[PDB]
Amino acid sequence: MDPLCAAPCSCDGDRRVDCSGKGLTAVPEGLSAFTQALDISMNNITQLPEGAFKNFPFLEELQLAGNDLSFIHPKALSGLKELKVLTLQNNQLKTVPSEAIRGLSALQSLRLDANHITSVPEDSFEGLVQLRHLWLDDNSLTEVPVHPLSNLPTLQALTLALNKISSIPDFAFTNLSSLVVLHLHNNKIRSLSQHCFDGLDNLETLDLNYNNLGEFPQAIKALPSLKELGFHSNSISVIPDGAFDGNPLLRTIHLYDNPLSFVGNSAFHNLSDLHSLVIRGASMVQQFPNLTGTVHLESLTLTGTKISSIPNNLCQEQKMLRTLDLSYNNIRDLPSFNGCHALEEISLQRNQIYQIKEGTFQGLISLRILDLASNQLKSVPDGIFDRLTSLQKIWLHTNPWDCSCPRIDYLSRWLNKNSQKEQGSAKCSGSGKPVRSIICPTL
Numbered sequence: 001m002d003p004l005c006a007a008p009c010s011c012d013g014d015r016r017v018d019c020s021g022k023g024l025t026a027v028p029e030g031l032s033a034f035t036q037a038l039d040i041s042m043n044n045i046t047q048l049p050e051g052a053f054k055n056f057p058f059l060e061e062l063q064l065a066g067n068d069l070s071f072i073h074p075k076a077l078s079g080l081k082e083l084k085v086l087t088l089q090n091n092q093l094k095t096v097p098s099e100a101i102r103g104l105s106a107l108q109s110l111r112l113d114a115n116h117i118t119s120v121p122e123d124s125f126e127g128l129v130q131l132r133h134l135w136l137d138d139n140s141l142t143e144v145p146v147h148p149l150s151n152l153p154t155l156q157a158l159t160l161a162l163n164k165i166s167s168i169p170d171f172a173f174t175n176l177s178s179l180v181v182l183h184l185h186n187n188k189i190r191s192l193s194q195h196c197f198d199g200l201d202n203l204e205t206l207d208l209n210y211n212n213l214g215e216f217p218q219a220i221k222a223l224p225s226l227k228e229l230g231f232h233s234n235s236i237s238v239i240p241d242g243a244f245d246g247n248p249l250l251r252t253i254h255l256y257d258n259p260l261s262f263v264g265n266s267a268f269h270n271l272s273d274l275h276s277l278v279i280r281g282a283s284m285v286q287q288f289p290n291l292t293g294t295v296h297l298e299s300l301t302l303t304g305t306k307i308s309s310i311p312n313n314l315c316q317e318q319k320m321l322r323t324l325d326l327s328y329n330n331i332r333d334l335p336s337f338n339g340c341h342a343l344e345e346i347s348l349q350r351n352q353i354y355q356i357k358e359g360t361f362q363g364l365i366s367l368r369i370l371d372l373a374s375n376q377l378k379s380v381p382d383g384i385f386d387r388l389t390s391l392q393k394i395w396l397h398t399n400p401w402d403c404s405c406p407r408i409d410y411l412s413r414w415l416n417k418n419s420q421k422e423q424g425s426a427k428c429s430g431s432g433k434p435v436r437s438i439i440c441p442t443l
Ligand SMILES: *[C@@H]1O[C@H](CO)[C@@H](O)[C@H](O)[C@H]1NC(C)=O
Pocket: 023, 025, 044, 046
């Protein structure tokens, strides 16, 4: 028995009390009023009466998750003027308890997720002059609670994810000037009004994944601080030129699981902080994306297009490239790769490459993986693989290799000496013999 505590709870030396999972039906008695954190989650507190926390006026953290809480008296949380964190997720609240939280003027974090909230009273959040994080995810909201959110200029993170929001009107978040993170994933958003995000000048993260967007949202043009954008698993068919004109600081764009058939040639131009670009199955794309000003790209994947040409300045403009996958397009001519000193992984399988020019592989000192399978290569220049000191694995098979001597001399001898590196077998057109097995006559 702890004299400075109270059974069945547990107390530490820093005024933190753990009374979680003890079958409690009420707020514990016998504890110090100077208690700073109270964890009473995972109990059986189905209701909080008037004066519930009368003995905890100095409380800073309160965890009430995983009870089956369905009612909070308007006066249950009276006196909690030091409360910074309130945790209410995984309960049976049907409405936002606006009355009960009105006097919580020090509150910085409010978790209301995983309840069954269908409505937000128009006066919700009015007293929360310090709120920084608001979780309203995993409920049954059918709209953005516009007027309640107008009360929170200090808010930095908001989630309205896993609800049933179908549209967002003009100026829905306009008072949220401190907002940095906005989650709207797993709703049914089909309509974003032209000015729905106006006022969110500090927003760095927007998550629109798993929605029902068709037209690409022009509304994101009002997001100058945007660094991370997710709109994967929607119904977007085209990413137009100018799409990211308002977002020069974008580092991350998740755009997969969309029926993307076309992307504008300049859609990803002038994005100096963009780290990676992965676009697959945009079948109507014919020209290589204009990436002028997009100089910090470390990874690029472009597959399933009609692209037949790669710009010669690729390894100049995109010098930081570590990973390059341009497989399953229609490429015939390759650029020089000399400027790509950081390139570790290259995939060019299933194109129409018929030649490599001499001395275009000399700068590839970091190259570990080289995939040239399923092309139209009959030959390579002598000493093409000379400078590939980091090379681990190479694919050369499914090419019509001309095994005439002395044309095949270098490659046959290279593949023999470097047999551990070759994956599958480059074979001679006609005879079907492995290229490594050919010994050309010598002087
Ligand atoms: C929770 O409290 C209710 C009402 O007092 C009670 O009927 C129920 O048995 C409790 N649930 C438990 C102990 O799991």
